[PDB]
């Protein structure tokens, strides 16, 4: 099976860590905070890592049956977390949490949805605090708390199917910081994470991580004063599904890709997609000023020692 | 260039008309209301139709720059509640940020909602230097609202219960869908009923064509998802669904492939690894829809199976009953 990547243009592709179109290409330096994403992790051979799901609507969310608090203004909803396909989460399996689980610390704003209940469908404004300040974010051990903001009493009884679907992160000085590179404590503050997808840090001199960027919406209680945010991923969802379906063996350490721009009638830059599932470029840190109506084209398998042309 | 379809299992794929995972396969009869979706329309050759965008996050939404209005019982409750709302006016554009071509070959910008309902969602103003902003919102796409006119370059978004001072001209906004309204007092959600893209005073144009299986004994196979329902916190409205002809992953696969169609339909087999066999077969007509030899209703098959292209066949090829 010969390797290839999608011929879709970047601006048509989606963030594998958050529900957003890709609207930027940025180069990240080797900062103190090492990229350690659990969503959007896929090798060139189509091996999914961490909490990566192919179900794009399940990304950075939680779902499962409601349970009573004892078994574990605002109303608290308690879920027995499960996988996107509705099968149970394997607590002692090879994932740090159910697939799609948020993989950063913040207060994530969204909607709690109870979409199939026979007594009537229900939904409500909600949030999930994934910072260590929330002792109840413990998806690794099978449960998580969702807070219904300003309502929900009488609607959170046990035994009904719920999803939490993300919209934004909180912003403003009083509220917990959004830190997309900071992994949560999936088992809460009393227990350790396990089976994390490994860190991503380019090994070769002069090569830096290329990230796909999106806008991150911000909630600040209607003030409209909080600074605008972004969120990044290693590969768009469309790359991940393509690689997964293909299952192409890796014939070297990296796939040399050229970014092709039809309107320019030429290649604009080249990158190496390492087998481990990340792209690097020979460029300094910062935003890449290229049009996003171009696509990546696989040209050759190359070694780690292959020297990329400067962007 | 050889034809193929994705080998992804159904429960991993997504609805091309709404932000939801596929959680059902259902067969629809040849009802009075003909399928006429504008989103999720792609031929087997990868030709996108109607308002179909590959940008999955742009599906059933609106986006563009804010503009000024100038540039453009239940009754008592409606009146009072509406007074608390703020209207946002957008000059609608395409998902990639390029302008909408009013005299182009689409009925509306790509991703535009393609059914009548009151669609509940979030109005998001994500890049403003003064500060990012968002608010609970809705878009009434029924003919009863004269201001849903994306075909002519503008549309109204209603910010529910607030938004005053935040809707000034010249800023980038998106409306991202969450649910439809439900309840007897509120406008009906009718997923098979196309909106008036130019409002009630003007006609639609360049619609993707109707979908109605032509061969006897063949009925349309649809990919189903849950449709969340908003009912002002009551939790009493009946649960809903939404359907599409092909999941997004089929559409991107077909678009990237650009395989010429070698006959009227592609014979696909639905393969279930745990069963170690094919569970049923269907025909994916070149026009971009699947049919099965089955009566109307839900198909009771596990969704951890995938479709496999086996052969090009004519319209007269007789499918094995499901």
mmCIF file with all atom_site columns, N, CA and C in Angstrom, chain A residues 169-194:
data_model
loop_
_atom_site.group_PDB
_atom_site.id
_atom_site.type_symbol
_atom_site.label_atom_id
_atom_site.label_alt_id
_atom_site.label_comp_id
_atom_site.label_asym_id
_atom_site.label_entity_id
_atom_site.label_seq_id
_atom_site.pdbx_PDB_ins_code
_atom_site.Cartn_x
_atom_site.Cartn_y
_atom_site.Cartn_z
_atom_site.occupancy
_atom_site.B_iso_or_equiv
_atom_site.pdbx_formal_charge
_atom_site.auth_seq_id
_atom_site.auth_comp_id
_atom_site.auth_asym_id
_atom_site.auth_atom_id
_atom_site.pdbx_PDB_model_num
ATOM 1  N N  . UNK A 1 169 ? -13.935 28.493 25.481 1.00 0.00 ? 169 UNK A N  1
ATOM 2  C CA . UNK A 1 169 ? -13.286 28.449 26.788 1.00 0.00 ? 169 UNK A CA 1
ATOM 3  C C  . UNK A 1 169 ? -13.551 29.757 27.513 1.00 0.00 ? 169 UNK A C  1
ATOM 4  N N  . UNK A 1 170 ? -13.538 29.717 28.838 1.00 0.00 ? 170 UNK A N  1
ATOM 5  C CA . UNK A 1 170 ? -13.700 30.936 29.611 1.00 0.00 ? 170 UNK A CA 1
ATOM 6  C C  . UNK A 1 170 ? -12.467 31.824 29.493 1.00 0.00 ? 170 UNK A C  1
ATOM 7  N N  . UNK A 1 171 ? -12.701 33.128 29.586 1.00 0.00 ? 171 UNK A N  1
ATOM 8  C CA . UNK A 1 171 ? -11.648 34.124 29.579 1.00 0.00 ? 171 UNK A CA 1
ATOM 9  C C  . UNK A 1 171 ? -12.023 35.240 30.533 1.00 0.00 ? 171 UNK A C  1
ATOM 10 N N  . UNK A 1 172 ? -11.057 36.089 30.864 1.00 0.00 ? 172 UNK A N  1
ATOM 11 C CA . UNK A 1 172 ? -11.265 37.140 31.841 1.00 0.00 ? 172 UNK A CA 1
ATOM 12 C C  . UNK A 1 172 ? -10.393 36.856 33.044 1.00 0.00 ? 172 UNK A C  1
ATOM 13 N N  . UNK A 1 173 ? -9.953  37.915 33.715 1.00 0.00 ? 173 UNK A N  1
ATOM 14 C CA . UNK A 1 173 ? -8.957  37.798 34.763 1.00 0.00 ? 173 UNK A CA 1
ATOM 15 C C  . UNK A 1 173 ? -9.375  36.937 35.937 1.00 0.00 ? 173 UNK A C  1
ATOM 16 N N  . UNK A 1 174 ? -10.664 36.953 36.253 1.00 0.00 ? 174 UNK A N  1
ATOM 17 C CA . UNK A 1 174 ? -11.166 36.235 37.419 1.00 0.00 ? 174 UNK A CA 1
ATOM 18 C C  . UNK A 1 174 ? -11.246 34.724 37.191 1.00 0.00 ? 174 UNK A C  1
ATOM 19 N N  . UNK A 1 175 ? -11.256 34.310 35.927 1.00 0.00 ? 175 UNK A N  1
ATOM 20 C CA . UNK A 1 175 ? -11.557 32.922 35.579 1.00 0.00 ? 175 UNK A CA 1
ATOM 21 C C  . UNK A 1 175 ? -10.302 32.098 35.272 1.00 0.00 ? 175 UNK A C  1
ATOM 22 N N  . UNK A 1 176 ? -10.402 30.762 35.394 1.00 0.00 ? 176 UNK A N  1
ATOM 23 C CA . UNK A 1 176 ? -9.230  29.904 35.168 1.00 0.00 ? 176 UNK A CA 1
ATOM 24 C C  . UNK A 1 176 ? -8.655  30.046 33.765 1.00 0.00 ? 176 UNK A C  1
ATOM 25 N N  . UNK A 1 177 ? -7.334  29.953 33.662 1.00 0.00 ? 177 UNK A N  1
ATOM 26 C CA . UNK A 1 177 ? -6.647  30.175 32.397 1.00 0.00 ? 177 UNK A CA 1
ATOM 27 C C  . UNK A 1 177 ? -6.872  29.040 31.412 1.00 0.00 ? 177 UNK A C  1
ATOM 28 N N  . UNK A 1 178 ? -6.995  29.403 30.140 1.00 0.00 ? 178 UNK A N  1
ATOM 29 C CA . UNK A 1 178 ? -7.011  28.437 29.052 1.00 0.00 ? 178 UNK A CA 1
ATOM 30 C C  . UNK A 1 178 ? -5.579  28.154 28.619 1.00 0.00 ? 178 UNK A C  1
ATOM 31 N N  . UNK A 1 179 ? -5.129  26.921 28.836 1.00 0.00 ? 179 UNK A N  1
ATOM 32 C CA . UNK A 1 179 ? -3.760  26.517 28.515 1.00 0.00 ? 179 UNK A CA 1
ATOM 33 C C  . UNK A 1 179 ? -3.771  25.257 27.656 1.00 0.00 ? 179 UNK A C  1
ATOM 34 N N  . UNK A 1 180 ? -3.754  25.439 26.340 1.00 0.00 ? 180 UNK A N  1
ATOM 35 C CA . UNK A 1 180 ? -3.978  24.325 25.425 1.00 0.00 ? 180 UNK A CA 1
ATOM 36 C C  . UNK A 1 180 ? -2.851  23.295 25.422 1.00 0.00 ? 180 UNK A C  1
ATOM 37 N N  . UNK A 1 181 ? -1.679  23.676 25.929 1.00 0.00 ? 181 UNK A N  1
ATOM 38 C CA . UNK A 1 181 ? -0.529  22.775 25.957 1.00 0.00 ? 181 UNK A CA 1
ATOM 39 C C  . UNK A 1 181 ? -0.364  22.078 27.303 1.00 0.00 ? 181 UNK A C  1
ATOM 40 N N  . UNK A 1 182 ? -1.273  22.363 28.232 1.00 0.00 ? 182 UNK A N  1
ATOM 41 C CA . UNK A 1 182 ? -1.209  21.810 29.578 1.00 0.00 ? 182 UNK A CA 1
ATOM 42 C C  . UNK A 1 182 ? -2.228  20.690 29.741 1.00 0.00 ? 182 UNK A C  1
ATOM 43 N N  . UNK A 1 183 ? -1.741  19.458 29.833 1.00 0.00 ? 183 UNK A N  1
ATOM 44 C CA . UNK A 1 183 ? -2.620  18.307 30.003 1.00 0.00 ? 183 UNK A CA 1
ATOM 45 C C  . UNK A 1 183 ? -3.362  18.341 31.339 1.00 0.00 ? 183 UNK A C  1
ATOM 46 N N  . UNK A 1 184 ? -4.634  17.910 31.339 1.00 0.00 ? 184 UNK A N  1
ATOM 47 C CA . UNK A 1 184 ? -5.372  17.803 32.600 1.00 0.00 ? 184 UNK A CA 1
ATOM 48 C C  . UNK A 1 184 ? -4.936  16.588 33.400 1.00 0.00 ? 184 UNK A C  1
ATOM 49 N N  . UNK A 1 185 ? -5.370  16.520 34.656 1.00 0.00 ? 185 UNK A N  1
ATOM 50 C CA . UNK A 1 185 ? -5.233  15.318 35.467 1.00 0.00 ? 185 UNK A CA 1
ATOM 51 C C  . UNK A 1 185 ? -6.462  14.459 35.205 1.00 0.00 ? 185 UNK A C  1
ATOM 52 N N  . UNK A 1 186 ? -6.331  13.487 34.305 1.00 0.00 ? 186 UNK A N  1
ATOM 53 C CA . UNK A 1 186 ? -7.477  12.704 33.853 1.00 0.00 ? 186 UNK A CA 1
ATOM 54 C C  . UNK A 1 186 ? -8.101  11.876 34.975 1.00 0.00 ? 186 UNK A C  1
ATOM 55 N N  . UNK A 1 187 ? -7.328  11.610 36.025 1.00 0.00 ? 187 UNK A N  1
ATOM 56 C CA . UNK A 1 187 ? -7.818  10.841 37.163 1.00 0.00 ? 187 UNK A CA 1
ATOM 57 C C  . UNK A 1 187 ? -8.048  11.736 38.377 1.00 0.00 ? 187 UNK A C  1
ATOM 58 N N  . UNK A 1 188 ? -8.033  13.047 38.160 1.00 0.00 ? 188 UNK A N  1
ATOM 59 C CA . UNK A 1 188 ? -8.150  13.991 39.255 1.00 0.00 ? 188 UNK A CA 1
ATOM 60 C C  . UNK A 1 188 ? -6.830  14.136 39.989 1.00 0.00 ? 188 UNK A C  1
ATOM 61 N N  . UNK A 1 189 ? -6.795  15.007 41.007 1.00 0.00 ? 189 UNK A N  1
ATOM 62 C CA . UNK A 1 189 ? -5.561  15.353 41.725 1.00 0.00 ? 189 UNK A CA 1
ATOM 63 C C  . UNK A 1 189 ? -4.991  14.245 42.619 1.00 0.00 ? 189 UNK A C  1
ATOM 64 N N  . UNK A 1 190 ? -5.756  13.188 42.879 1.00 0.00 ? 190 UNK A N  1
ATOM 65 C CA . UNK A 1 190 ? -5.308  12.134 43.789 1.00 0.00 ? 190 UNK A CA 1
ATOM 66 C C  . UNK A 1 190 ? -4.633  10.962 43.075 1.00 0.00 ? 190 UNK A C  1
ATOM 67 N N  . UNK A 1 191 ? -4.649  10.964 41.745 1.00 0.00 ? 191 UNK A N  1
ATOM 68 C CA . UNK A 1 191 ? -4.127  9.837  40.975 1.00 0.00 ? 191 UNK A CA 1
ATOM 69 C C  . UNK A 1 191 ? -3.473  10.283 39.668 1.00 0.00 ? 191 UNK A C  1
ATOM 70 N N  . UNK A 1 192 ? -2.580  9.444  39.148 1.00 0.00 ? 192 UNK A N  1
ATOM 71 C CA . UNK A 1 192 ? -1.781  9.785  37.976 1.00 0.00 ? 192 UNK A CA 1
ATOM 72 C C  . UNK A 1 192 ? -2.471  9.433  36.662 1.00 0.00 ? 192 UNK A C  1
ATOM 73 N N  . UNK A 1 193 ? -2.075  10.131 35.603 1.00 0.00 ? 193 UNK A N  1
ATOM 74 C CA . UNK A 1 193 ? -2.450  9.757  34.247 1.00 0.00 ? 193 UNK A CA 1
ATOM 75 C C  . UNK A 1 193 ? -1.752  8.454  33.871 1.00 0.00 ? 193 UNK A C  1
ATOM 76 N N  . UNK A 1 194 ? -2.247  7.789  32.831 1.00 0.00 ? 194 UNK A N  1
ATOM 77 C CA . UNK A 1 194 ? -1.581  6.610  32.291 1.00 0.00 ? 194 UNK A CA 1
ATOM 78 C C  . UNK A 1 194 ? -1.806  6.514  30.785 1.00 0.00 ? 194 UNK A C  1
#
